[PDB]
């Protein structure tokens, strides 16, 4: 509309209305020029790719994308508390995206010093993939999302994708994508871009912890009319065989007949936080649960949803099984165990098997007069009829949605890193600096982004008499307030925050 | 009414869905020891990123597998013994063993080896290699799992998963190109020799 008239205002806040929450977030972004406007082939052998399991082939593009998949984008820590303490469930409904107050800069080195000034004729290209024709990279828990603190300015990530490969070489079925082939909108410093999205119907994420365990659902006061086999022998001696039977009742609860059985397991190795207990060998990769695809071994991470540890065993964690976040300022490579925070899904222990334990036992043979009964450990167990399980929890730092791969079939599409699986997730938003001339003007753009999500809530109806567990900040005397900036002005998040505090009956 | 049979090949593989340019914010366990010697235990962590793509956390996992014996078209490569019946994967019903044919939908062979085919796993010899993106190889183990608790006295031990049932977060493709038996329950009724399953 004009160079001297602003194209949009600054909206950040949350409105709590009844069963719904509306969270608006507005950030200031900066977009450079990537690859000097050049689509470029990339593969492992460029960096040497010494492992076959690491072999990849794909392209890096001049475009950039806006990523708001993580939760702390849309929720302040306070708003996250109000959500998790008061609600049994939630899920997104509507999405509203706006891109405005674009500004483009040109970079020049005059004499020995660098110069930057407004380029008022330059444009920015932006488009959304609403037919989902491009490779969808959002659901891989990648970096580059809007900063948790709204006062930080962030650098848009460079888009890219991969396709089929054999070793580092491509194949005849591989694909290539020119984002320029998509109709996009072009924006001058007076233009602004917006669109509205509609989440597809998904189940509420369950932000609650069961108050009953799957094997304790019985009435403790009453016997069962069913019978179990108590004795196979009368006593010590020869030819003592017998069959005795007993009522399943309160005195012995292990053997009662039950209608439902815990969810599936794929065993993880168990690592102790205290380092002395762990074995003195390099078993980090050689001892890890993996799955192989087309000859390549992928680590199983995080894997099926399973409790992190048995009750009263805080030190142990199940290797690749639990999500691990870095603390503020954490180094990229080979950091110490203290430098990172390992989350533990012990909330789901009641209905889900412990990740580091065998699912159970099965008989391996037929007993006979000449053969004793023999059993073996079930290390992994697929779905059986009558299993129940809980999904993995979502965190303030964790992902929100993923795209369900488009396939003939799937089971319980809910993604394994947590969040809402969707066949048509929020579409990707691609952006780039229009090239201004293989010799171009060095140029970058900056502007604002606002995003608005409407969340639906499931209120807590419970009749529990005694008070709940609640997420709370302790009353402490320390140098720095939690979830706030320090003296140098750095914002940090002290610990990962789970969603499961309130309880329900099983 | 039945779903549209998928007649395409994925251009991506299940494990490669990541953006190759960017790091994850997640961490993994890189080193369990500092160096060679006694009492070297440590825990070191590193960001999962493009440099090492195997260890990244992923939202979905390949479909189920029931392993088939691998057979080469070059008769010199194969063993000098009769393994057609003993070797073959079977399922037992009421005391009667039944060969598994064609079985669950699985990639016929690894990429780069086309001379091998699953014993009972193919329609006769068609190859399923189109689906090797989302499905495990019929001649391969699904993966590994830990068999014990490590400790100061015990090294970590793993074992090979030969068969794996459904897990939450699996995706798979059906066989490339029937009546649904009338039962209390079924899962993914699409028939194993291919086509459209229907209750009528």
């Amino acid at each position, epitope marked *: 509309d004009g160079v001297g008239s602003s194209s949009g205002n600054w909206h950040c806040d949350s409105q709590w209305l009844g069963d719904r929450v509306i969270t608006t977030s507005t950030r200031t972004w900066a977009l450079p020029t990537y690859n000097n406007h050049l689509y470029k082939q990339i593969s492992n052998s460029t960096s040497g790719g010494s492992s076959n399991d690491n072999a990849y082939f794909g392209y890096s593009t001049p475009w950039g994308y806006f990523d708001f998949n993580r939760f702390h984008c849309h929720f302040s820590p306070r708003d996250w508390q109000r959500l998790i303490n008061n609600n049994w469930g939630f899920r997104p409904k509507r999405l509203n995206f706006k891109l405005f107050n674009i500004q483009v800069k040109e970079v020049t080195d005059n004499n020995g010093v660098k110069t930057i000034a407004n380029n008022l004729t330059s444009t920015v290209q932006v488009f959304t993939d609403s037919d989902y024709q491009l490779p969808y990279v959002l659901g891989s828990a990648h970096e580059g999302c809007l900063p948790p603190f709204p006062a930080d300015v962030f650098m848009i990530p460079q888009y890219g994708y991969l396709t089929l490969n054999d070793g580092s070489q491509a194949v005849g079925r591989s694909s290539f994508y020119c984002l320029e082939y998509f109709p996009s909108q072009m924006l001058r410093t007076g233009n602004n871009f917006q669109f509205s999205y509609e989440f597809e119907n998904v189940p509420f994420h369950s932000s609650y912890a069961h108050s009953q365990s799957l094997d304790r659902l019985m009435n403790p006061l009453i016997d069962q009319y069913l019978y179990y086999l108590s004795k196979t022998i009368n006593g010590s001696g020869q030819n003592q065989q017998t069959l005795k039977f007993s009522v399943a009742g309160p005195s012995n609860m292990a053997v009662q007949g039950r209608n439902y059985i815990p969810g599936p397991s794929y065993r993880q190795q168990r690592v102790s936080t*205290t*380092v*002395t207990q762990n074995n003195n060998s390099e078993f980090a990769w050689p001892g890890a649960s993996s799955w192989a695809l087309n000859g390549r071994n992928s680590l199983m991470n995080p894997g099926p949803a399973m409790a992190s540890h048995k009750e009263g065993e805080d*030190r142990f964690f199940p290797l690749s099984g639990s999500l691990i976040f870095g603390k503020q300022g954490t180094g990229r490579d080979n950091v110490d165990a203290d430098k990172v925070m390992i989350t533990n899904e012990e909330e789901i222990k009641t209905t889900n098997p412990v990740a580091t334990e065998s699912y159970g036992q099965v008989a391996t043979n037929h007993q006979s007069a000449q053969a004793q009964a023999q059993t073996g450990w079930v290390q992994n167990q697929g779905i059986l009829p009558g299993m129940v399980w809980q999904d993995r929890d979502v965190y303030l730092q964790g992902p929100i949605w993923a795209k369900i791969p488009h396939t003939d079939g799937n089971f319980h599409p809910s993604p394994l890193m947590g969040g809402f699986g969707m066949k048509h997730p929020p579409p990707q938003i691609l952006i780039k600096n229009t090239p201004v001339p293989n010799s171009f003007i060095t140029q970058y753009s900056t502007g604002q982004v606002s995003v608005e999500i409407e969340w639906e809530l499931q209120k807590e109806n419970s009749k529990r008499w005694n008070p709940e567990i609640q997420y709370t900040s302790n009353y402490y*005397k*320390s140098n720095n307030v939690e979830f706030a900036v320090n003296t140098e002005g750095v914002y940090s998040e002290p610990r990962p925050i789970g969603t499961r505090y309130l309880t329900r009956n099983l | 009414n039945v779903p549209f049979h998928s007649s395409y090949a994925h251009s991506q593989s299940l494990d490669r869905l990541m953006n190759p340019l960017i790091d994850q914010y997640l961490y993994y366990l890189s080193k369990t020891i500092n160096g060679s010697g006694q009492n070297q*235990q440590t825990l070191k962590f590193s960001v999962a990123g493009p440099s090492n793509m195997a260890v990244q956390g992923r939202n979905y996992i390949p479909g189920p597998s029931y392993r088939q014996q691998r057979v080469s078209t070059t008769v010199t490569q194969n063993n000098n013994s009769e393994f057609a019946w003993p070797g073959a994967s079977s399922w037992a019903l009421n005391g009667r063993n039944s060969l598994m044919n064609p079985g669950p939908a699985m990639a016929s062979h690894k990429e780069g080896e086309d001379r091998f085919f699953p014993l009972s796993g193919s329609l006769i010899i068609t190859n399923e290699e189109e689906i090797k993106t989302t499905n495990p190889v019929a001649t391969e183990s699904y993966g590994q799992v830990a068999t014990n608790h490590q400790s100061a006295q015990a090294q970590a031990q793993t074992g090979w998963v030969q068969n794996q049932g459904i897990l939450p977060g699996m995706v798979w493709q059906d066989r490339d190109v029937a009546k649904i038996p009338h039962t209390d329950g079924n899962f993914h009724p699409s028939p194993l020799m291919g086509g459209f399953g229907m209750k009528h």
Partner: antibody, heavy 127, light 111 residues
Framework: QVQLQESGPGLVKPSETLSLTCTVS????????WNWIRQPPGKGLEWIGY???????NYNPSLKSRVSVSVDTSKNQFSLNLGSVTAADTAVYYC?????????????????????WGQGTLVTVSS | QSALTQPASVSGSPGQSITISCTGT?????????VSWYQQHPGKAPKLMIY???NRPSGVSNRFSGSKSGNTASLTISGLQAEDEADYYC??????????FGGGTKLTVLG
């Protein structure tokens, strides 16, 4: 109000095992980590080790060979057994409690800051 | 492991801030922010003045404070009084998840 009380023989002959028990009153053992500290008279504190109701233990590397720490949840008391004592083991033995952790969010080993302490008992090792 | 190193004694006149230090190796002190300070009156069990390097429990006055630079953590006592004379110990979490104490420091209030 949590109170700890150490009890046990005040005299131990060399090359014999030393035994002490701490009985917590007012509060149960619960999820807490119980520690043993010893102070040789006129010298600094030294940490023996701890025990957890799951039976987990962690010991001082110098004492790791000859020391053991046990817990009895039924009697609401935990114990110390130190074997092959010498005169260097004469000290005042304290039982302490690791401070309560207000968050169940992460998986970590305990970092030691003590919230409560016994009064301590003197144990002399002499022939 | 190796004990933490402290001055044997420090004295000051009432009203004057006092700083006690404990030096530790990179793995034990320098490495993590988990250093505690205990005061022990004669014949009493130690009391926890400061935990997690600079934090202090409820029941401890402003006058007690602590800080960490490199391999050395320091305890600062502001506006000290008569009741503030005791033995102060530095405690630290180590690399192998063991606890290590300083040698102890005696604070004498001149007067």
């Amino acid at each position: 109000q949590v109170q700890l009380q150490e009890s046990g023989p005040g005299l131990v002959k060399p090359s014999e095992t030393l035994s002490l028990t701490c009985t917590v009153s007012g509060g149960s053992i619960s999820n807490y980590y119980w520690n043993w500290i010893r102070q040789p008279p006129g010298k600094g504190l030294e940490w023996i080790g701890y025990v957890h109701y799951s039976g987990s233990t962690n010991y001082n590397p110098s004492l790791k060979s000859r020391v053991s720490v046990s817990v009895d949840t039924s009697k609401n008391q935990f114990s110390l057994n130190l074997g092959s004592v010498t005169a260097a083991d004469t000290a005042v033995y304290y039982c302490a409690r690791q401070s309560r952790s207000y968050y169940n969010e992460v998986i970590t080993d305990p970092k030691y800051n003590f919230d409560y302490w016994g009064q301590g008992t003197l144990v002399t090792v002499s022939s | 492991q190796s004990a933490l190193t402290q001055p044997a004694s420090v004295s000051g006149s009432p009203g004057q801030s006092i700083t006690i230090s404990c030096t530790g190796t990179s793995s034990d002190v320098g490495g993590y922010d988990y250093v505690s300070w205990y005061q022990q009156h004669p014949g009493k069990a130690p009391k926890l003045m400061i935990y997690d390097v600079s934090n202090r429990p409820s029941g401890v006055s402003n006058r007690f404070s602590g800080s960490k630079s490199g391999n050395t953590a320091s305890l600062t006592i502001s506006g000290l009084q008569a009741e503030d004379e005791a033995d102060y110990y530095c405690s630290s979490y180590t690399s192998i998840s063991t606890l290590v104490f300083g040698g102890g420091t005696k604070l004498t209030v001149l007067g």
